[PDB]
């Protein structure tokens, strides 16, 4: 395990609003098999103190769902702890390489393993940025084979009262 630098002079009101997931880099089993249950995943973000309040949205078996979490800040700008809500413990979230207008690369960590995500404000991404994500995966010592490019269409937002996990 190792340290990667969070976004220097980060601003939470610039990360706010909607985002769409392009890809995930991880050694995790449930992507290298069962990957047909990768689905079109998007975020709404709103700042709450130095922490970021996060809603993820996804289709679970044709029904649109919402997932609610705090990126509770560690007291270091651009680092957050996922509020330790369940028996898996806590996940560290580090915003690694971004511009608020187009793209974000995140690192997420548990059990001494790094993992990474690429997000965009709108559906396509520039090949240099996507190559940057591949290099961040290689620099995380993961293979490009451990990169999973999520469904490029059919996203959803605003799930009903009964389709939100309320995990916080």
């Amino acid at each position: 395990i190792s340290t990667i630098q969070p976004k220097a002079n980060f601003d939470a009101q610039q990360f706010a609003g909607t985002w769409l997931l392009v890809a995930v880099g991880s050694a995790c089993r449930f992507l290298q098999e069962q990957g047909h249950r990768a689905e079109a995943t998007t975020l709404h973000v709103a700042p709450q103190g130095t922490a970021m309040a996060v809603s993820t949205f996804r289709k679970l078996d044709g029904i649109c769902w919402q997932v609610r979490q705090l990126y509770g800040d560690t007291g270091v700008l651009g680092r957050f702890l996922l509020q330790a809500r369940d028996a898996r413990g806590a996940v560290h979230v580090v915003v690694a390489e971004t511009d608020y207008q187009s793209f974000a690369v995140l690192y997420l960590e548990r059990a001494g393993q790094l993992s990474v995500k690429l997000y965009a404000r709108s559906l396509p991404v520039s090949d240099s940025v996507l190559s940057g994500f591949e290099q961040r995966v290689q620099e995380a010592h993961l293979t490009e084979d451990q990169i999973f490019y999520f469904p490029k269409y059919g996203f959803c937002e605003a799930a009903d009262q009964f389709h939100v996990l309320d995990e916080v």
């Binding site: 997931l21 991880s26 993820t56 769902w65 996940v91 997420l108 996990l165």
Partner: protein, 50 residues
């Protein structure tokens, strides 16, 4: 019969059901306890006007 309970995992992006409380231990004083899911509803409405 109700163990099914949703969980997200933020690392590797999965939505999965908890695998918690799948079984309960039965006390010796209980012969059978059965976790059968039923509903029945019955509704009657009557209106009379003169």
């Amino acid at each position: 019969g109700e163990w099914r309970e949703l969980r997200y995992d933020s690392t590797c992006e999965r939505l999965y059901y908890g695998d918690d409380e799948k079984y309960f231990r039965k006390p010796y004083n209980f012969l059978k306890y059965h976790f059968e899911a039923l509903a029945d509803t019955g509704i009657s409405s009557e209106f009379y006007d003169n």
